[PDB]
């Protein structure tokens with residue numbers, strides 16, 4: 001359910017199919033069952049000890065193709081299993097989980113930028129569209145806090161976004177929440193305690209290192225200790241009350257750089273480095289493969 005940091009897919013010269021797990025308890029990396037198709041700018045989530053890869057795109061030399069797929073990886077069997085496909089392909093996707101259901105936010109398909117949202121029901125192996133986001137959003141940040149889905153930043157088609165909105169599943173509607181202090185396309189969005197962190201990204205001109213959090217109670221975005229490196233198209237996850245950023249693009253290189261955020265000590269620290277440097281990775285935390 002939650003023990004190893006899994007890094008699914010990514011990109012470096014082409015869309016990677018790598019599935020490496022990191023043990024923060026001994027700094028080790030474990031290469032596992034490669035993804036059936038390589039994918040990049042996909043989402044990674046965990047539902048009931050099972051790891052899911054949602055969306056992305058296969059930027060290959062033989063031709064680039066956005067994904068509608070939702071694969072499943074099992075730490076016990078160390079196997080990938082193709083599950084029910086989402087109505088649409090969604091590259092630079094956003095995913096969150098509310099009450100054991102995967103929500104698939106925005107993402108792009110060819111020139112189209114999606115405003116749409118779809119909900120996977122693992123018990124039935126079905127995908128059903130729900131009300132769409134108020135804005136079209138790619139490279140969107142998605143986080144669930146208090147059984148509410150939040151879509152942070154992204155790119156509408158014309159503008160890079162600082163805006164964010166919340167989804168209330170019962171009413172099946174989206175309302176805008178306080179906008180960020182910074183414009184963030186290709187952010188790294190997660191939830192730690194009661195705050196929603198939006199780290200790095202691209203403000204239209206440069207890769208960001210700034211990390212700002214949204215406090216739900218107070219409804220205000222606030223800056224915190226910046227990251228060591230500037231990153232857009234980065235991996236983010238929370239493990240044992242510490243935010244972990246994974247790779248991404250700095251403006252010059254596709255980083256191998258993995259940083260941990262101690263919110264208690266308000267500090268970012270170089271924790272390891274992924275085998276290969278890469279961007280657009282899918283990242284989730286679940287049980288070891290034993």
Ligand SMILES: Cc1cc(C)c(C)c(S(=O)(=O)Nc2ccc(N3CC[C@H](C(=O)O)C3)c3ccccc23)c1C
Nearest residue numbers: 011040041059092139185186202232233249279280
């Ligand atoms: C540098 C770069 C160039 C190429 C050719 C590709 C293919 C990749 S990628 O695989 O990682 N995909 C992604 C490219 C660009 C992204 N955002 C970030 C900022 C950028 C913008 O508004 O300018 C759009 C992404 C966001 C989330 C996930 C994957 C993203 C990368 C990062």
